Design a protein around this ligand. Structure first.
Ligand SMILES: [Cl-]
Ligand SMILES: [Fe+3]
Length: 313
């Protein structure tokens, strides 16, 4: 049982997941780089699976004609109707929330509400987010354009960029740490990164958790919900290990794999039969935005374009 896996995932604890399945050859790069590669390789690509951390990039790979369909009883039963492709071209295996983090010392959480409100001039020199090319931010801005239209997203972005603590650098975790070091006050980053810190024995990670808290945005009165994205995969069209590939997707939907995603990388499992991690549950029930995740991919070029325009570097 052996695959060639094209992964844009970036979690060292993922290795244990791959080993538990079988012989797994990793081809790891950014989703964009992986898509261009599968394309340039043509009918000769040895790739079996494309595993991303973004429904947007899944949507684009799917639009490009990269996935072959995979119907099976197990998948059909274990993956929610909305977190997958109707024809089964790809499946979402985890869910994750793009949340807000804030300084417990400098921020009153009664001041927080939405991503939108962060363009208020009251956050001059106070916001931390990672670079615009990142897929998480792409998706977020794309969902905003879907929901509010371009002019309003442009406005939000103009405002938000003006409120940057520094030129964006570092990953989601780096923005959480920067809050602790007092470089900024509020950060946009994914939920599961914070839970990792809460479980860490590292005294420096407890120092970040002691200083920084998680706030769910857009969950209040009249608000749509938290931006939720998904990590997912589908079988590539020229898979030389077609059988092993399907075995992998079903393996990702298995109690074991979902239990790993839940309590090893602190994401939200998608299958019934596995609980959300207690440390993640302690924060509250996830109130995610209903938006069809196809929008995330549909508005990606506009998102890239817009963030370029306002100067989000
Ligand atoms: Cl990705
Ligand atoms: Fe991540």
């Amino acid at each position: 049982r052996t695959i060639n896996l094209y992964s844009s995932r970036h979690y060292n604890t993922d290795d244990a997941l791959y080993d538990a399945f079988g012989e797994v050859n990793l081809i790891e790069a950014s989703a964009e780089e992986l898509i261009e590669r599968i394309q340039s390789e043509g009918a000769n690509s040895p790739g079996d699976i494309l595993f991303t951390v973004d429904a947007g990039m899944l949507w684009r790979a799917e639009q490009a004609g990269l996935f072959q369909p995979v119907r099976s009883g197990k998948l059909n039963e274990r993956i929610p109707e909305n977190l997958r492709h109707p024809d089964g071209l790809w499946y979402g295996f985890t869910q994750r929330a793009r949340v807000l983090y804030y300084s417990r010392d400098r921020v009153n959480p009664a001041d927080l509400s939405t991503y939108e409100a962060l363009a208020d001039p009251q956050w001059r020199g106070k916001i931390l987010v990672r670079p615009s090319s990142n897929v998480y931010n792409l998706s977020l801005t794309a969902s905003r354009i879907a929901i509010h239209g371009e002019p309003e997203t442009r406005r939000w972005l103009q405002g938000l960029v003006g409120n940057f603590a520094r030129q964006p650098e570092g990953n989601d975790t780096a923005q959480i740490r920067a809050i602790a070091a007092g470089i900024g006050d509020v950060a946009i980053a994914n939920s599961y990164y914070y839970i990792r810190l809460q479980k860490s024995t590292d005294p420096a990670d407890q120092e970040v958790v002691e200083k920084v808290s998680l706030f769910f945005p857009n969950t209040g009165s009249g608000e749509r919900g938290t931006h939720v994205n998904v990590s997912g995969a589908g079988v590539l069209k020229n898979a030389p290990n077609r059988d092993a590939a399907i075995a992998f997707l079903e393996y990702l939907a298995s109690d074991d794999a979902q239990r790993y995603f839940a309590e090893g990388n602190n994401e939200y499992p998608v299958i019934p039969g596995v609980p959300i991690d207690p440390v993640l549950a302690a924060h509250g029930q996830l109130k995610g935005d209903p938006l069809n995740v196809s929008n995330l991919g549909r508005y990606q070029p506009d998102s890239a374009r817009l963030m370029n325009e306002v100067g989000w570097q």
